[PDB]
Ligand binder design. Structure first.
Ligand SMILES: CC(C)Nc1cccnc1N1CCN(C(=O)c2cc3cc(NS(C)(=O)=O)ccc3[nH]2)CC1
Lengths: 405, 538
């Protein structure tokens, strides 16, 4: 039978406009859709359906075989509710698998289908878009893994008992398998899981335990100039928003007088102590920070430049759950949008591994720029929420100061 | 009517069909409406009904242009606001630039198409209207629609859908033919020779006929260059049809605004169109009907525009086997002109972006924006991004982008030296300047009295303070920096606590909304080296 799925009280179906696609992408979607049409998974719809959800074609690791990807973010937020492993983060190596291919097996409630309406665009609009709706469980839709949960655990159990030292977690179309076995034995065991998964209907890795909490390193110098001290004080002052024990008084006293920026200032013992105490405070994360599951997770990113990027995940301003840095991947040398997308995906995978949810991003990129080119470098099955922001000059300056090896 | 499956139509959430009373008409209008309705009744378009229908829509009677023949119109205005929402019909029509050159083209007319597609037999009751009788007494003749009603909300969408089902087979059978649906028109073009082409068309027409959709008559046919909204489509290219400027020695505000409208649109195609002096006339206008005399300067540019508009600008069609190239020029601060072509001088399209009079930006940022706008435009027209030819050195780009706080990017491009070249007007020093004077600037203003002071004290003993009336604190802070700049040599170190100038350090803008910041920019540009240092206030 089909489970009667419905929308949250008062909500209506999504009517998100389809963004223009490149010719390659359109061709790929059309092929893919014709196939799914033949396989009875999706069906052409009429004008009596006013709903719509964005669709695009991605590519991931390993192929030319364009993968269809639908942006169900709005539908997910409108879908009724249906109401996590603490050890997954402490695993040596975690592998991700796309179990999205399993949903086509289960049919979607007929009365809900209308809401899955999506559209393949036409170049120069010389042809009306090709409208379709789902007949089965859609990939990327929250209701899919939920409905398919009964079946999912069932198929997974046999592997879980053969290997309960391994932790398996499911988020959307993904499955993260974390084990403490060494690379080879780990991967060999994963393929064992896949082979097991393949006798039903579907088809590198992370290292969580390595995610070290990096501190802030303050500059040290033989001689300090008026400007060096000034820059140090600016950053320390900002840092007092996190660590209220940080002090700039004794340093600020050295800044008394209209002296040349390049002039060298001898540090008074009192100022020297202050700097020492400050370094001690920054030696460890601020106390009392804990994750509240009933709160939205936030991820802010700053463009540090030269391929470097910094981020912080929190819920309350300054009470950071995690902070990190991302260097551009080989190849992304002239593309910011690629580095950013890669960053968002990396940060999001961590958020899932750690808290089992995707954070809401604050991206230092113009709406237009992002929306025009993010898809070209997207590889994950899911899509996180995002807002576009103006990065404050100091927040960047402070996190740039993070400790490196 | 036709033998096509009807579309399931429903009313909005919880509403009911219109129940508006029938407008009173004369024996004349009525007698007319009666005959038309008897005709439609037999064509199967409408059906005579009765009391088993509480819904009603006002029917009206009008005669057509410089003529006389009673027609009819039904005000579905109400039914429309009560009918469900449908899928959005193509609001964005194609653009000649993206049209592939077809050896033979043909445009069919299916005006009657609306009244050919059946209406959802369930929904029909809601389209009931009434032909009144002679002066509010004997009951009028009642009817309802059995076909897609003209003026009804869902008609255009439903008709388009139907046309698609019907065309799907033909399209598959012979893919070398390109069909385009637009209003009551089908623009069928192919690479076949005229004879084979005509044969296909007849097959197509006959195919539609089998479906109930009849096509044009020897009279109602579109033949010469297809006048497709402001464009004449020729086989070799497409031209811009006459955009005429009226000769009036009396111009009202309306006349001037409308004129500027036409002129502004012309700025996209025609090189050199200017309206500055025209716009100037709108200053302090007290009424649409006010007549403002054209200043000499206005009469001159209007004259120049008249000449520019009488030039043969023509575009070309799209050839997939050829590269898409877009070149940009900075036509003054903020304004950018571009032309997308495949083979030199043969443009597929041209255009220019007015200037977003921004709060705080720079040319490289603006160049980027123009680039992104063009890209989206290209992706929508050709499903491709073009190769860019930008008047900016790779070195300029690398230096700027690689250090901007915001993610920015420009697709595959190439430098084209066609002055003026966009550039970085200045670059703030990376470190303090050894030797150069150090200004400690400060401006403070009482936000309420709007009275303040802006000054500085340097390590060289130079000092100054200026009293300002009707200012704001931000203005003083900035002004402080201004004086610092004005009174300093070619190399300066400036320290301020204005984290609003900290914004200038990170973004280094070369244009702003405020005249003050602009002045500062002018000064910055003038120095050989400037080092801006921010320090926490108080
Ligand atoms: C409705 C819009 C979207 N156009 C359009 C829609 C659908 C298919 N194709 C289209 N176009 C392709 C580009 N294009 C030509 O290549 C062309 C014009 C043309 C004129 C004559 N002769 S004439 C009538 O006397 O001017 C002879 C051969 C010709 N070829 C015009 C038509």
């Amino acid at each position: 039978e089909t489970v009667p799925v419905k929308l949250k009280p008062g909500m209506d179906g999504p009517k998100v406009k389809q963004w223009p696609l490149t010719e390659e992408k359109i061709k790929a979607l059309v092929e893919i859709c014709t196939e799914m049409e033949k396989e009875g998974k999706i069906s052409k719809i009429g004008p009596e359906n006013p709903y719509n959800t964005p669709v695009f074609a991605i590519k991931k690791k390993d192929s030319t075989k364009w993968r269809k990807l639908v942006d169900f973010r709005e539908l997910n937020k409108r879908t009724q509710d249906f109401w996590h492993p603490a050890g997954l983060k402490k695993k040596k190596s975690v592998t991700v698998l796309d179990v999205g291919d399993a949903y086509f097996s289960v049919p979607l409630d007929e009365d809900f289908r209308k809401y899955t309406a999506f559209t393949i665009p036409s170049i120069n609009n010389e042809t009306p878009g090709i409208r379709y709706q789902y007949n089965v469980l859609p990939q990327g839709w929250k209701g899919s893994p939920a409905i398919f949960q009964s079946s999912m655990t069932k198929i997974l159990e046999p592997f879980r008992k053969q290997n309960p030292d391994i932790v398996i977690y499911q988020y959307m179309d993904d499955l993260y398998v974390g084990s403490d076995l060494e690379i080879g034995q780990h991967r060999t065991k994963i393929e064992e899981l896949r082979q097991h998964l393949l006798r039903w209907g579907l088809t590198y890795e992370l290292h969580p335990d390595k995610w070290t909490v990096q501190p802030i390193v303050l500059p040290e110098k033989d001689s300090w100039t008026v400007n060096d001290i000034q820059k140090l004080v600016g950053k320390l002052n900002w840092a007092s928003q996190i660590y209220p024990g940080i002090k700039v008084r004794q340093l600020c006293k050295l800044l008394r007088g209209t002296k040349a920026l390049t002039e060298v200032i001898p540090l008074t013992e009192e100022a020297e102590l202050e700097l020492a105490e400050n370094r001690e405070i920054l030696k460890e994360p601020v106390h009392g920070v804990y994750y509240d599951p009933s709160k939205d997770l936030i991820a802010e990113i700053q463009k540090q430049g030269q391929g470097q990027w910094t981020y912080q995940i929190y819920q309350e301003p300054f009470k950071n759950l995690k902070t990190g840095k991302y260097a551009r991947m080989r190849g992304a040398h002239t593309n910011d949008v690629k580095q950013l997308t890669e960053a968002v995906q990396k940060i999001t995978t961590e958020s899932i591994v750690i808290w089992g949810k995707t954070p809401k991003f604050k991206l230092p990129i113009q709406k237009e720029t992002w929306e025009t080119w993010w898809t070209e470098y997207w590889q994950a099955t899911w899509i996180p929420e995002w807002e576009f922001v103006n990065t404050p000059p100091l927040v960047k300056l402070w996190y740039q100061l993070e400790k490196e090896p | 009517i036709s033998p096509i499956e009807t579309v399931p139509v429903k009313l909005k959430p919880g509403m009911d069909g219109p129940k508006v009373k029938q407008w009173p008409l004369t024996e004349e209008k009525i007698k007319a409406l009666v005959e038309i309705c008897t005709e439609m009744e037999k064509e199967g378009k409408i059906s005579k009904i009765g009391p088993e229908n509480p819904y009603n829509t006002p029917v009206f009677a009008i005669k057509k242009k410089d003529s006389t023949k009673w027609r009819k119109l039904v005000d579905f205005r109400e039914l429309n606001k009560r009918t469900q929402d449908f899928w959005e019909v193509q609001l964005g029509i194609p653009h000649p630039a993206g049209l592939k050159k077809k050896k033979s083209v043909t445009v069919l007319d299916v005006g009657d198409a609306y009244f050919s597609v059946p209406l959802d037999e369930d929904f029909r009751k809601y389209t009931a209207f009434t032909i009144p009788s002679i002066n509010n007494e004997t009951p009028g003749i009642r009817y309802q629609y059995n076909v897609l009603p003209q003026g009804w909300k869902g008609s255009p969408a439903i008709f388009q859908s139907s046309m698609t089902k019907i065309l799907e087979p033909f399209r598959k059978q012979n893919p070398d033919i390109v069909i385009y649906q637009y209003m009551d028109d089908l623009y069928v073009g192919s690479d076949l020779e005229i004879g084979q082409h005509r044969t296909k068309i007849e097959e197509l027409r006959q195919h539609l006929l089998r479906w109930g959709l009849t096509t044009p008559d020897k009279k109602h046919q579109k033949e010469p260059p297809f006048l497709w909204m402001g464009y004449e489509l020729h086989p070799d290219k497409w031209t811009v049809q006459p955009i005429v400027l009226p000769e009036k020695d009396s111009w009202t505000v309306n006349d001037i605004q409308k004129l500027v409208g036409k002129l502004n649109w012309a700025s996209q195609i025609y090189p050199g169109i200017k309206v500055r002096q025209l716009c100037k006339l709108l200053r302090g206008t007290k009424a649409l009907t006010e007549v403002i005399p054209l200043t000499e300067e206005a009469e001159l540019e209007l004259a120049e525009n008249r000449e520019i508009l009488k030039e043969p600008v023509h575009g070309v069609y799209y050839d997939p086997s050829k590269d898409l190239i877009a070149e940009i020029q900075k036509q003054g601060q903020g304004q950018w002109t571009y032309q997308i072509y495949q083979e030199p001088f043969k443009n597929l399209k041209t255009g220019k972006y007015a200037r977003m009079r921004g709060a705080h930006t720079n040319d490289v940022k603006q160049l980027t924006e123009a680039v992104q706008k063009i890209t989206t435009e290209s992706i929508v027209i050709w499903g491709k991004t073009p190769k860019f030819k930008l008047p900016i050195q790779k070195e300029t780009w690398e230096t700027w982008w690689t250090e901007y706080w915001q993610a920015t990017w420009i697709p595959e491009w190439e430098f084209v030296n066609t002055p003026p070249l966009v550039k970085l007007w200045y670059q703030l020093e990376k470190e303090p300047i050894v030797g150069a004077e150090t200004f400690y600037v400060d401006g403070a203003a009482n936000r309420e009295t709007k009275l303040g002071k802006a000054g500085y004290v340097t390590n060289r003993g130079r000092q100054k303070v200026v009293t300002l009336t009707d200012t704001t604190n931000q203005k003083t802070e900035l002004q402080a920096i201004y004086l610092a700049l004005q009174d300093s040599g070619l190399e300066v170190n400036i320290v301020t606590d204005s984290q609003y100038a900290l914004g200038i350090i990170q973004a280094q803008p070369d244009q702003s909304e405020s005249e003050l910041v602009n002045q500062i920019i002018e000064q910055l540009i003038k120095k050989e080296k400037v080092y801006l240092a921010w320090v926490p206030a108080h």
